[PDB]
Amino acid sequence: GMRVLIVEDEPYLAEAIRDGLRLEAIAADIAGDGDTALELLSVNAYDIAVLDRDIPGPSGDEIAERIVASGSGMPILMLTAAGADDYLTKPFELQELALRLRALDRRRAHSRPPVREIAGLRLDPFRREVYRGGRYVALTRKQFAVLEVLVAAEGGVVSAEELLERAWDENADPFTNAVRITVSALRKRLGEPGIIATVPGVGYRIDT
Ligand SMILES: [Mg+2]
């Protein structure tokens, strides 16, 4: 079934909302503040984020911006007292929330969430961290952006030109030596065994 993240700070409310979804076959994790929300987003995968706007720590709008920047396409539903796919005013009927969640999910029912793990690597875009078999590998911003694209291709081949468009600038001056030296540095950082394969005329890919 569906897994959602509920971020709401009002006492008992986050737990009560998860409770109302339980028998709707919609499971949920909860958080009362933005720091906990980000920590959960670094570890678990969710189908939708339900975010109260005014919460302690990083606000609900700041969480929404970081989800949007992650490039996952995960739908976001904001809760308001009274960017984002939809907004819901508190208090709301539970059937109303379950309807919005299902509608948001089925719009993208056949799309796939990003590939963040392959061949031992785990990539977390929220903390911008890479783990190889559980071992932390520090990476520069450019190295991470290139690796993020290669991992998301799940062994598919990515040209040096696409890496330049996606990790430097969509209308960049097509010079690919910078991409080549960055991939080479990434290979040194990741270590043995070799995980980034070169396809001579086309580009690079994650091996196995
Ligand atoms: Mg609040």
Numbering used by the authors: 0 to 81, 94 to 219
The study reports:
VanR is the response regulator of the VanR–VanS two-component system, which controls the expression of a vancomycin-resistant phenotype in many bacteria, including soil microbes such as Streptomyces coelicolor as well as serious human pathogens such as vancomycin-resistant enterococci.
X-ray crystal structures were determined for the inactive and activated states at resolutions of 2.3 and 2.0 Å, respectively. For both conformational states, no electron density was observed for the 12 C-terminal residues (221–232), suggesting a highly flexible C-terminal tail. In the structure of inactive VanRSc the linkers from two adjacent molecules in the crystal lattice associate in an antiparallel manner, leading to the formation of a symmetric pair of hydrogen bonds between the carbonyl O atom of Arg123 and the amide proton of Arg123′ of the symmetry mate, along with a similarly symmetric pair of hydrogen bonds between the side chain of Arg123 and the carbonyl O atom of Pro124′. The main structural differences between the two activity states center around the stability of α4 and the oligomeric state of the protein. Comparison of the two structures illustrates that phosphorylation of VanR is accompanied by a disorder-to-order transition of helix 4, which lies within the receiver domain of the protein. The inactive conformation of the protein does not appear intrinsically unable to bind DNA; rather, it is proposed that in the activated form DNA binding is enhanced by an avidity effect contributed by the receiver-domain dimerization.
